């Protein structure tokens, strides 16, 4: 198998 | 926008990884020796350290690295997979006590996450929840010095 990235977290709370 | 912490998964387990010094670190008890998925195919671990429960791949896309702590503060802050922050007071090289114990579930799926100092710098990687009757009162972790040495 393999590890897949299902999400991300931005520590500073920076919005797009 | 780039994240320093990525929520990763395997066929049977979901946990976290943290980019520090260009490497995507996580706990061996979750990743094992698995490759990390990439839009160009599987990427192999740059580091594998079964003893320290530490593994790392090159930092993926959409990520930005965290800076290691240099203030030696003992007032830590653990970030869970749900973005919650949990104040943890350090008790030693790789142990800390939650200021307010929480149901073990509250911390589930978060091993691999960061333990931040008051400045938001990486103190260590959350390794495991130390709990009594279902209530997590302390935390076990991998200090950044380990990652740093491992990168050598
Ligand atoms: Zn610091």
> How far is residue B129's CA from residue B103's CA, in Å, rounded to a whole number?
10
Domain definitions of chain B by residue range: 1-66, 67-151
Specify the experimental method.
Answer: X-ray
Question: What is the structure's resolution, reported in angstroms to one decimal?
Answer: 2.5
8 Å CB contact of A6 and B7: yes
Residue with tokens 């965290």: B66
Three-state secondary structure call for residue B111:
coil
Among B89, B107, B85, smallest CA distance to B97 is for B89
Among B98, B121, B111, B117, smallest CA distance to B142 is for B111
CATH number of B1-66: 2.40.10.120
Cβ proximity of A5 and B42 under 8 Å: no
The domains spanning B1-66 and B67-151 adopt the same CATH topology: yes
* C-alpha separations of B52 from B143, B145, B147 in Å: 10, 12, 9
Question: For chain B, what is the radius of gyration of the CA atoms?
Answer: 14
The rounded Å distance from CA B56 to ligand 1 centre is: 22
CATH number of B67-151: 2.40.10.10
Give yes or no: B111 in active site. yes
Task: Give the distance, in angstroms, between the CA of residue A12 and the centroid of all CA atoms in the same chain.
Answer: 13
């Amino acid at each position: 198998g393999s590890v897949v990235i299902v999400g991300r977290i931005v520590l500073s709370g920076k919005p797009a | 926008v780039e994240g320093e912490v990525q929520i990763v998964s395997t066929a049977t387990q979901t946990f976290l990884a943290t980019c520090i010094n260009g490497v995507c670190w996580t706990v061996y008890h979750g990743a094992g020796t698995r490759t990390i998925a990439s839009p160009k195919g599987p990427v192999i671990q740059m580091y594998t350290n079964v003893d320290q429960d530490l593994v790392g791949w090159p930092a993926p896309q959409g990520s930005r690295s965290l800076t290691p702590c240099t203030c030696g503060s003992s007032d830590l802050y653990l970030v869970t997979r749900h973005a919650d922050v949990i104040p943890v007071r350090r008790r030693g090289d790789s142990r800390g006590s939650l200021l307010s114990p929480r149901p073990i579930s509250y911390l589930k799926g978060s091993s691999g996450g960061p333990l931040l100092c008051p400045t938001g710098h990486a103190v260590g990687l959350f390794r495991a929840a130390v709990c009594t009757r279902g209530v997590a009162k302390a935390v076990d972790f991998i200090p950044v010095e380990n990652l740093e040495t491992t990168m050598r």
